[PDB]
Design a protein around this ligand. Structure first.
Ligand SMILES: [Zn+2]
Length: 460
C-alpha cells in the first residue's frame, strides 16, 4: 500500500567500504609514443591544486544539520529540492516529495581539466554520540493533509549521512555529547574515541580525522591534539590562514582558519552575500597570493542553493572552471601527497616512458581521497599512441593543459565496485533520471577497462 503511513529508519543500500581502503598505493603508468613523436626528455610535478585549479574553496557545514542533506548535498547532486521543507533519504527513495519541490536541472560541479565532471565537495560535522541521529522518518506518499513529515529535524539522521558518504562528502567532529560541566580537556579527550566508534559502526568503518571547533571552545582543540586520529582541524581564531601557493610546512594537526562571513546586524545581507564579496576581492590578486576561501556554514537554505549555483556558473563547469571546491579532508590529503610523494618518469625504450609515484597516507587511518594530478612537461596528447596503468589505478583521465600534459589519477581501491552499485541502483529504479545520471557520473570516473565497458552498456 503506497498511501499508508510508515515510520522508518532511513537506510541506503550500499556504502563505500571505507574500512577496506588500502593505505598504500603504487602508481605505474606506461606511456607509449607515436613513431615520429619520440621526445628527448620529460619531467613531472604534482601541481599546487588538484586538476591544475587556480584557487581553493573549502566548505564545512557545522551542527550536523538536516539542511546539509536537504539543501547542500541535494543541490550539488541534482536531487529534488524544496524552498521551505527538509527531505530525508527515504522521501527521495519513495518519491514522497514536499508540495513545493523543484530541481535546478543540473548538478553543481567543476571539471577535472580532462573532460570529466567533478561535483562540488564539502564536509559536515557529525553528532555521532547523540541519539537524535536515530530519529525515524515519516513517509506517506500522496498524503497532503499536512506536511509535518518534511519539517526540519534537530540534526541529520544516520541514513542521510550514510548516503552522503557515497558522494565523497567528508565528516568532522564538533560538539561531543557530554554535560557542559564535563567539557574539560581530559573528558573531551576520552569522549573522542566513543564518538569515533559510532562513526565507524555507522559509516562502514570510515575513521573521522577532522575537528571543526565548536562554540569558540579551545578545550576542543587542546583535547583533539591529544587524540592522534585527528589530523586536521579548523577554527575561526587561533588558526593558520591557508595560502595554498605559499604554504610550505607540515600541516599535520594544524588548525586551518575558516570564516562564517556573518553579515552586519540589520544590514539585510546574507552569509552568501558576504562570501561572494570576499571571493570577488580575493580574485583580484594573482593566484599565488590568494588565500583559500575557507568557509563554515550553519543552516543552508534557498539563498545557499542559489549561491552554490552562482559558483558553478562563475568559477565552475559553467564558468571559468578555475576553482577547486572541496572539503578540508580531501585537501589535507592532497597537500600531504604533494609534500611526500615524488613522481618520477623514466624512459624504458625509445618510444616508451614509465611514470611512477607512491601515494602513502598517514599511519592513523587510510586516507580516503587517494587521487592526484600529475603534470608531464615535454609531452602532448598528440604524441601519445597509448597509455596503460597498473591495478592500483582505478580512475585515469588525461589531456593537454596549457603547454603541458596532465593526468588525473584515482586510486580508490573499490571505485569500480562503487560505480557498479550506482548502476545496480539505476537498474532497480530505471525511471529515475537522477539515478541514471549518477550511474553515468560514477562510471565515467573509471579508467578504460572491460568493467567500464560492461557498466556503460548497462546504462545506455
Ligand atoms: Zn556549532
Amino acid at each position: 500500500d503506497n498511501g499508508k503511513r510508515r515510520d522508518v529508519i532511513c537506510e541506503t543500500e550500499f556504502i563505500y567500504p571505507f574500512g577496506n581502503e588500502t593505505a598504500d598505493k603504487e602508481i605505474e603508468i606506461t606511456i607509449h609514443l607515436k613513431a615520429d613523436r619520440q621526445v628527448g626528455y620529460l619531467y613531472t610535478e604534482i601541481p599546487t591544486l588538484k586538476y591544475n585549479k587556480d584557487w581553493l574553496f573549502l566548505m564545512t557545514q557545522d551542527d550536523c544539520m538536516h539542511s546539509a542533506f536537504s539543501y547542500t548535498w541535494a543541490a550539488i547532486h541534482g536531487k529534488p529540492l524544496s524552498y521551505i521543507y527538509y527531505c530525508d533519504l527515504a522521501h527521495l527513495q519513495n518519491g514522497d516529495l514536499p508540495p513545493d519541490y523543484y530541481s535546478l536541472g543540473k548538478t553543481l560541479a567543476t571539471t577535472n581539466g580532462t573532460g570529466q565532471e567533478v561535483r562540488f565537495s564539502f564536509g559536515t560535522t557529525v553528532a555521532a554520540d547523540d541519539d537524535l541521529m536515530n530519529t525515524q522518518t515519516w513517509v506517506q506518499n500522496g498524503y497532503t493533509r499536512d506536511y509535518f513529515r518534511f519539517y526540519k529535524k534537530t540534526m541529520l539522521v544516520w541514513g542521510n549521512l550514510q548516503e552522503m558518504m557515497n558522494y565523497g562528502v567528508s565528516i568532522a567532529f564538533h560538539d561531543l555529547n557530554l554535560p557542559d560541566e564535563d567539557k574539560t580537556e581530559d573528558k573531551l579527550l576520552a569522549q573522542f574515541p566513543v564518538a569515533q566508534s559510532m562513526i565507524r559502526e555507522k559509516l562502514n568503518n570510515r575513521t573521522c580525522k577532522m575537528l571543526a571547533e565548536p562554540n569558540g571552545d579551545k578545550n576542543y582543540i587542546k583535547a583533539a591534539l591529544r587524540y592522534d586520529k585527528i589530523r586536521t582541524l579548523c577554527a575561526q581564531s587561533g588558526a593558520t590562514k591557508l595560502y595554498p601557493f605559499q604554504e610550505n610546512g607540515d600541516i599535520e594537526q594544524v588548525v586551518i582558519e575558516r570564516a562564517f562571513y556573518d553579515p552586519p546586524e540589520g544590514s539585510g545581507l546574507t552569509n552568501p552575500d558576504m562570501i561572494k564579496a570576499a571571493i570577488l576581492k580575493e580574485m583580484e590578486n594573482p593566484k599565488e597570493e590568494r588565500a583559500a576561501i575557507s568557509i563554515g556554514a550553519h543552516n543552508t537554505d534557498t539563498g545557499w542553493v542559489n549561491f552554490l549555483e552562482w559558483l558553478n556558473d562563475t568559477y565552475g563547469r559553467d564558468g571559468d572552471d578555475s576553482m577547486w571546491f572541496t572539503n578540508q579532508e580531501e585537501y589535507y590529503e592532497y597537500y600531504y601527497y604533494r609534500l611526500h610523494s615524488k613522481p618520477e618518469i623514466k624512459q624504458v625504450n625509445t618510444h616508451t616512458w614509465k611514470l611512477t609515484l607512491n601515494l602513502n597516507g598517514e599511519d592513523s587511518a587510510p586516507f580516503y581521497y587517494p587521487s592526484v594530478t600529475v603534470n608531464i612537461f615535454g609531452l602532448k596528447m598528440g604524441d601519445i599512441e597509448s597509455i596503460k596503468s597498473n591495478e592500483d589505478v582505478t580512475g585515469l583521465s588525461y589531456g593537454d593543459h596549457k603547454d603541458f600534459f596532465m593526468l588525473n589519477i584515482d586510486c580508490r581501491k573499490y571505485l569500480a565496485e562503487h560505480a557498479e552499485n550506482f548502476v545496480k541502483r539505476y537498474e532497480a529504479n530505471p525511471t529515475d533520471v537522477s539515478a541514471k545520471a549518477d550511474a553515468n557520473y560514477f562510471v565515467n570516473m573509471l579508467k578504460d577497462s572491460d568493467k567500464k565497458t560492461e557498466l556503460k552498456k548497462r546504462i545506455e
